[PDB]
Structure 1
Amino acid sequence: MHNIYFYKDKNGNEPVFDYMRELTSKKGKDSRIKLNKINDYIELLSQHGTRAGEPYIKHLDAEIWELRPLRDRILFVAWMDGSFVLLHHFMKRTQKTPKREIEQAKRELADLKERGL
């Protein structure tokens, strides 16, 4: 049930992870409690899909899934599946959080687009 892939950018070369890295650089776990994070919520995906998902995994708007308790994160997923995975994480202020990052949300399906050709 439910395999989960990862994505493709320019080089390819896709960063995504050194959020998941460089907390590997830092120190024990206040780094890795920050990221034991989704090892939980991604794991929580490939078992559940989202049935469930939420509370936590999300939606804000358009075509839609996903994510966590704490600071933060991500608005992420594509329909030919089970899997998906893709774009980036970067973080914030909240609780407003944004009218601008729901177009750095999408800013996305450029990704599920002709990037899924």
Structure 2
Amino acid sequence: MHNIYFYKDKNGNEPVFDYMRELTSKKGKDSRIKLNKINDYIELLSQHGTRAGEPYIKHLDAEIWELRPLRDRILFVAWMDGSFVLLHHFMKRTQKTPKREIEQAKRELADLKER
């Protein structure tokens, strides 16, 4: 129902996809666990959109949302109705979501509208 696209920066790289691909490359089986949880959550976002509710997704600031597959966090935005765009990844080492991350997403999102 809802399409999901990956953000591609100026360099032609997609940060979230890059992160999942290196997880795919690792021998560790917890890499597989994190991958599977990310698989479920993104797919869940695809079907229910932002209506999925917590714990899966959370509204952060303004246009920015986050996906919460375990301790992985994927910042995304509404886009191109009815779709979404995954901006970037960070592992959360605190119980606070740094606005360092959020402003990076805002700046990423900025880059999207520009181009």
State the TM-score, normalized to the length of structure 1.
Answer: 0.79
| 1:30 Cα offset (Å) | 0.9
Q: Which residue of 1 aligns with 2:24?
A: 24
Percent identity of equivalent pairs:
100
Distance 1:43 1:25, change over 3 A: same
Deviates more, 1:15-24 or 1:33-42: 15-24
Cα gap change, 1:16/1:64 in structure 2, threshold over 3 Å: closer, same or farther?
Answer: closer
| Aligned-residue offset at 1:102 | 2.1
Unaligned runs of 5+ in 2: none
Scaled by the length of structure 2, the TM-score of the pair is 0.80
Distance 2:113 2:91 in 1: 25
Give, in angstroms, the shift of residue 28 of structure 1. Answer: 5.6
**By percentage of residues, which structure has more helix?**
2
Q: What is the Cα-based RMSD across aligned positions, in Å?
A: 2.1
User: Stretches of 4+ moved more than 6 A in 1?
Assistant: none
1: CA distance, partners of 2:104 / 2:80: 22
Q: Which has the higher strand share?
A: 2
CA drift of 1:89 comes to: 0.8
Contiguous gaps of at least 5 residues in structure 1: none
The answer as to whether partners of 1:41 and 1:67 remain within 8 angstroms in 2 is yes
Q: Relative to structure 1, is the Cα distance of residues 87 and 20 closer, same or farther in structure 2, using a 3 angstrom cutoff?
A: same
